[PDB]
Enzyme design. Structure first.
Site, mmCIF file in Angstrom:
data_model
loop_
_atom_site.group_PDB
_atom_site.id
_atom_site.type_symbol
_atom_site.label_atom_id
_atom_site.label_comp_id
_atom_site.label_asym_id
_atom_site.label_seq_id
_atom_site.Cartn_x
_atom_site.Cartn_y
_atom_site.Cartn_z
ATOM 1 N N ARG A 74 0.603 -0.923 -0.055
ATOM 2 C CA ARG A 74 -0.204 0.217 -0.265
ATOM 3 C C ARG A 74 0.908 1.442 -0.075
ATOM 4 O O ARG A 74 1.847 1.115 0.835
ATOM 5 C CB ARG A 74 -1.079 -0.128 1.409
ATOM 6 C CG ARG A 74 -1.714 1.139 1.354
ATOM 7 C CD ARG A 74 -2.527 1.239 2.837
ATOM 8 N NE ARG A 74 -3.802 2.468 2.651
ATOM 9 C CZ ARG A 74 -3.173 3.910 3.748
ATOM 10 N NH1 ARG A 74 -2.723 2.970 4.528
ATOM 11 N NH2 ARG A 74 -3.950 4.301 3.772
ATOM 12 N N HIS A 120 -3.288 11.337 0.098
ATOM 13 C CA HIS A 120 -3.050 10.941 1.045
ATOM 14 C C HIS A 120 -3.058 12.371 1.728
ATOM 15 O O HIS A 120 -1.286 12.350 2.125
ATOM 16 C CB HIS A 120 -1.876 10.525 1.162
ATOM 17 C CG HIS A 120 -1.582 9.387 2.758
ATOM 18 N ND1 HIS A 120 -1.426 8.239 2.168
ATOM 19 C CD2 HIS A 120 -1.327 9.907 4.387
ATOM 20 C CE1 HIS A 120 -1.382 7.391 4.533
ATOM 21 N NE2 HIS A 120 -1.690 8.261 5.014
ATOM 22 N N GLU A 166 -7.776 8.546 5.954
ATOM 23 C CA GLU A 166 -8.185 8.833 7.264
ATOM 24 C C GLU A 166 -8.890 10.642 7.286
ATOM 25 O O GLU A 166 -8.128 11.514 7.514
ATOM 26 C CB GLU A 166 -7.003 9.326 7.932
ATOM 27 C CG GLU A 166 -6.604 7.892 8.688
ATOM 28 C CD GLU A 166 -4.947 7.676 9.103
ATOM 29 O OE1 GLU A 166 -4.495 8.681 8.976
ATOM 30 O OE2 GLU A 166 -5.233 6.908 9.741
ATOM 31 N N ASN A 296 -7.751 1.870 9.791
ATOM 32 C CA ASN A 296 -7.163 1.900 10.105
ATOM 33 C C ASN A 296 -7.079 1.898 11.614
ATOM 34 O O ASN A 296 -8.231 2.136 12.073
ATOM 35 C CB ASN A 296 -6.558 3.110 9.927
ATOM 36 C CG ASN A 296 -5.831 3.435 7.976
ATOM 37 O OD1 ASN A 296 -5.660 2.917 7.631
ATOM 38 N ND2 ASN A 296 -4.885 4.929 8.480
ATOM 39 N N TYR A 298 -5.406 1.520 15.564
ATOM 40 C CA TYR A 298 -3.806 1.726 16.324
ATOM 41 C C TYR A 298 -3.931 1.476 18.102
ATOM 42 O O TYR A 298 -3.398 0.492 18.639
ATOM 43 C CB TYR A 298 -3.888 3.096 16.622
ATOM 44 C CG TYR A 298 -2.493 3.104 15.158
ATOM 45 C CD1 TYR A 298 -1.605 2.906 15.388
ATOM 46 C CD2 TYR A 298 -3.297 3.937 13.607
ATOM 47 C CE1 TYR A 298 -0.700 2.916 13.337
ATOM 48 C CE2 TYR A 298 -2.098 3.765 12.293
ATOM 49 C CZ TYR A 298 -1.467 3.494 12.231
ATOM 50 O OH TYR A 298 -0.936 3.793 11.252
ATOM 51 N N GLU A 367 -4.089 0.599 7.519
ATOM 52 C CA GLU A 367 -2.681 0.313 8.987
ATOM 53 C C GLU A 367 -3.444 -0.210 10.047
ATOM 54 O O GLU A 367 -4.306 -0.358 10.486
ATOM 55 C CB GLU A 367 -3.321 2.490 8.878
ATOM 56 C CG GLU A 367 -2.264 2.836 7.779
ATOM 57 C CD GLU A 367 -1.936 4.112 7.629
ATOM 58 O OE1 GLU A 367 -1.589 5.008 9.672
ATOM 59 O OE2 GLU A 367 -2.440 5.140 6.415
ATOM 60 N N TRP A 417 1.680 -0.621 9.047
ATOM 61 C CA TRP A 417 2.342 0.713 9.365
ATOM 62 C C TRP A 417 3.620 0.739 10.182
ATOM 63 O O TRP A 417 3.851 0.378 11.265
ATOM 64 C CB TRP A 417 1.401 1.520 9.287
ATOM 65 C CG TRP A 417 1.913 3.076 8.958
ATOM 66 C CD1 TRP A 417 2.459 4.051 10.338
ATOM 67 C CD2 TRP A 417 1.531 3.532 8.270
ATOM 68 N NE1 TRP A 417 2.716 5.197 9.989
ATOM 69 C CE2 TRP A 417 3.043 4.808 8.346
ATOM 70 C CE3 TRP A 417 0.965 3.711 7.030
ATOM 71 C CZ2 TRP A 417 3.085 6.269 7.383
ATOM 72 C CZ3 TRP A 417 1.872 4.717 5.640
ATOM 73 C CH2 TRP A 417 2.066 6.290 6.046
ATOM 74 N N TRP A 425 4.593 13.283 10.529
ATOM 75 C CA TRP A 425 3.887 14.336 10.107
ATOM 76 C C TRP A 425 4.165 15.823 11.264
ATOM 77 O O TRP A 425 5.723 16.032 11.207
ATOM 78 C CB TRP A 425 2.372 14.261 10.406
ATOM 79 C CG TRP A 425 2.091 12.555 9.547
ATOM 80 C CD1 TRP A 425 1.581 11.749 9.536
ATOM 81 C CD2 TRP A 425 1.518 13.194 8.414
ATOM 82 N NE1 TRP A 425 1.618 11.596 8.801
ATOM 83 C CE2 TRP A 425 1.635 12.175 7.097
ATOM 84 C CE3 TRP A 425 2.087 14.491 7.281
ATOM 85 C CZ2 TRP A 425 1.063 11.838 6.124
ATOM 86 C CZ3 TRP A 425 1.524 14.173 5.932
ATOM 87 C CH2 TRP A 425 0.814 13.064 5.702
#
Lengths: 465, 465
Positions: A74, A120, A166, A296, A298, A367, A417, A425
């Site tokens: 990806r 993205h 996202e 995604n 986490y 992700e 990821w 970022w």
């Protein structure tokens, strides 16, 4: 008991996050090129000028993916490489098209199926100056629809497409908290932006379904992030409702207009007129605009209800987002990301939550991964022994295994990821998410971590044939 | 992180499965004494005539408990030891009262809090002959309420009381399939018996709450067994409703009338006439009659809906209880019990399901454990190395730990079934559920297995200091 042989797994990266070569071959500046130039916006005062230099290391990145057993990959397309000014009536750069086309050929030749993200976060800077960028309810969905078609046409050998990555991050951090590009802080615009990203998504999915999907029987969807929730006080019904509403403000925000056709009631009650109304034309674009569910995920957090009415700058649904419940039980150990605590149970609880609410759709985990606290300060020997990240992938993937094989969650892929440490970022290069260590001080060399060699023998155990 | 320090854990047994001495000290026969004499009802043609001889090994079983780290112990009072004929106007055997009164003193002296079950399936045979036993909606709830008051007055030091163990097993195996005592087969009697057992539960709760509970801050409730469900094909919405419906016919059969006031709607729809209605006086007994939720859990199944309407002899809810799903996934490996496949996620799943449907009640897991396939034919040294059972408990207990510390399930205790191998009802002694091996041929000698010594170091990890 076993995952079906058609389950995919690979790694995930993002264009501005790894590519570098920001002016090379006529690449136009994105809003993150502009944003990083603002002092104090990136924690380590860095940008994506070099990153991992992956733009020029195509042969190296494919060899790494192959050597790790990744049969899928990806990555995202840098829009400003394809259309440097971004707009539909702007000149198409052939050099970036040729770049990504040659990359897809070099991927398929190694036997790696690509999974491509169109947007993205790296919007062309010119579209932002020309008409307000994401804030424009009329222009941006037209410019994104055209940009999507340019890519659908350029890469016919691609079947797996992603519109937005996202969209919540482009709205609240980009127009509410101002931590991400373009850097605005409003109590109203994050809700307009999210609406514009939905309509832009629906327009591109319509173009793709109508003209490009049947050529090779492909698929397209949006990628929504989302961390799970548990009551801060399990005995307080207000914290159970606060746990559900938090998920609604995070994920049902975009998913309810796609699967159900309108925004969550709980957001409409709190935001009122700041949350836009889908026009009939806009509703026909967005409703049912997911071939699959791009997910995604986490972490998870304990959610405590709030007694005072929500403020104007509230974006999370007027709740407290904690790491300890009322009794003092912790979600998990700290990472380098202040918002990430490992919670494998929340990965399965989220997969199941998506399934029940949207009639068990086809889910691609796009992700999943973790940062490591202090990892950027460790010596190279200690960095490669990332038992924290190894353990993070074993418990989560095995939790995903339970949701798929027992609950019946229709999940068909998983993407760790990230493939390598990259530009996190606003955190800069201090926050390392990759299973491959990248030494930025010495030519951006790659050194696979103990987590990288760990995922092949794990998926070999879980996937059949 | 850590369970609260007031969390209880121990072991559970049942009177007729361990005591023996079926006619010592004036014990009348129960329906299981009559049942085991009928040829073909018991797998190995055995009975509880000797069992583990625990009636004459009081200090020794208490020593085994104290040696295994158990601070609590769940056990049942033989009704026909207290009142040989069971009735309210029938003579009371003081020798039985004195036996169980001295056992409580010895347990409290050994630092073991008792958790006493009033009715563990041993209806006195005389009641069965006098007015039809559990079938009588007028006589039996009166005789059970008086028998409960006798034990409340006899055992004032007890705080933890249990009315019925698994009323579903008394109802359907005993009156629908004829596999358990008293061995009848009817399309109507199971639903009558379940009602009588519910009213028999309410009268004792009222007597206890009004005249015995407040002096030592005690509690009382019913113990319901429930194995969790997952859709056989999660893409068929009829299979998710079927998985929910199965749980209703199995557990909400008794729990809905206690917490919500009436039987589940799905049971009303299928049974009609045969599902009785609560009278004004009955409803005042049943609704609200739980200080805590007593929960037995063991396994999980895949559930497939049925195309035909339910037939009159159905009890499960017109579903297929399977061990595999459509995709071919298995729940878990086989045991000696054909109905039991290890599935730790289902334990946590059932805990949260109870909590979301019943306003997060206080839960005590009164039975959890497993048998081992071929264990009765293994040599003595192989029996003691029961890693299968060791792993079963470690996963289920840690699944409960997650349920309590993350989801916030208000579980305050956990009893492992069983302290010793015992008489597994229709299976005989071939099915071994104990963490302690019992050599029945050599004077019922006790030999603790690897599982017996595994629990204390594990709960020492999970319970605060």
């Amino acid at each position: 008991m076993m995952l079906p042989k058609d389950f995919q797994w690979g790694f995930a990266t993002a264009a501005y996050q790894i590519e570098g070569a920001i002016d090379k071959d006529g690449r136009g500046p994105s809003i993150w090129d502009t944003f990083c130039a603002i002092p104090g916006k990136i924690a380590d005062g860095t940008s994506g000028v070099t990153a991992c230099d992956s733009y020029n290391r195509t042969a190296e990145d494919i060899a790494l993916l192959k050597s790790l057993g990744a049969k899928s990959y990806r990555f995202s397309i840098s829009w400003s490489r394809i259309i440097p000014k971004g707009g539909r009536d702007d000149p198409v750069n052939q050099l970036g098209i040729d770049h990504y086309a040659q990359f897809v050929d070099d991927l398929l030749e190694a036997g790696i199926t690509p999974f491509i993200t169109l947007f993205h976060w790296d919007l062309p800077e010119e579209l932002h100056q020309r008409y307000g960028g994401l804030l424009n309810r009329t222009e941006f969905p037209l410019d994104f629809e055209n940009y999507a078609r340019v890519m659908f046409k350029a890469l016919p050998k691609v079947r797996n497409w992603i519109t937005f990555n996202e969209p919540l991050c482009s709205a609240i951090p980009g127009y509410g908290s101002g931590t991400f590009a373009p850097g605005r802080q409003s109590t109203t615009e994050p809700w307009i932006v999210g609406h514009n990203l939905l309509v832009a998504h629906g327009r591109a999915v319509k173009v793709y379904r109508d003209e490009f999907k049947d050529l090779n029987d492909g698929q397209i969807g949006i990628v929504l992030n989302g961390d799970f929730t548990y009551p801060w006080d399990s005995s307080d019904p207000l914290d159970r409702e606060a746990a559900e509403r938090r998920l609604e403000f995070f994920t049902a925000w975009y998913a309810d207009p796609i699967y159900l056709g309108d925004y969550p009631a709980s957001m409409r009650k709190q935001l009122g007129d700041r949350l836009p109304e889908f026009t009939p034309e806009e509703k026909a674009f967005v409703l049912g605009s997911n071939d699959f569910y791009g997910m995604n995920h986490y972490t998870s957090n304990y959610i405590r209800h709030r007694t005072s009415p929500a403020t104007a700058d509230d974006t999370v649904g007027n709740v407290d987002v904690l790491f300890y419940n009322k009794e003092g039980q912790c979600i998990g150990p700290e990472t380098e990301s202040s918002w990430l605590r490992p919670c494998p149970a929340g990965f399965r609880d989220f997969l199941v939550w998506i399934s029940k609410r949207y009639n068990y759709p086809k889910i691609y985990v796009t992700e999943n991964g973790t940062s490591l606290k202090g990892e950027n300060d460790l010596p190279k020997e200690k960095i490669l022994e990332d038992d924290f990240r190894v353990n993070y992938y074993n418990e989560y993937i095995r939790a995903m295994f339970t949701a798929a094989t027992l609950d019946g969650v229709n999940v068909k892929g998983y993407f760790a990821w990230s493939l390598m440490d990259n530009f996190e970022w606003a955190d800069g290069y201090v926050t390392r998410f990759g299973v491959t260590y990248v030494d930025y001080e010495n030519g951006q060399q790659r050194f696979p971590k103990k987590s990288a060699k760990s995922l092949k023998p794990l998926f070999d155990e879980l996937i059949a044939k």
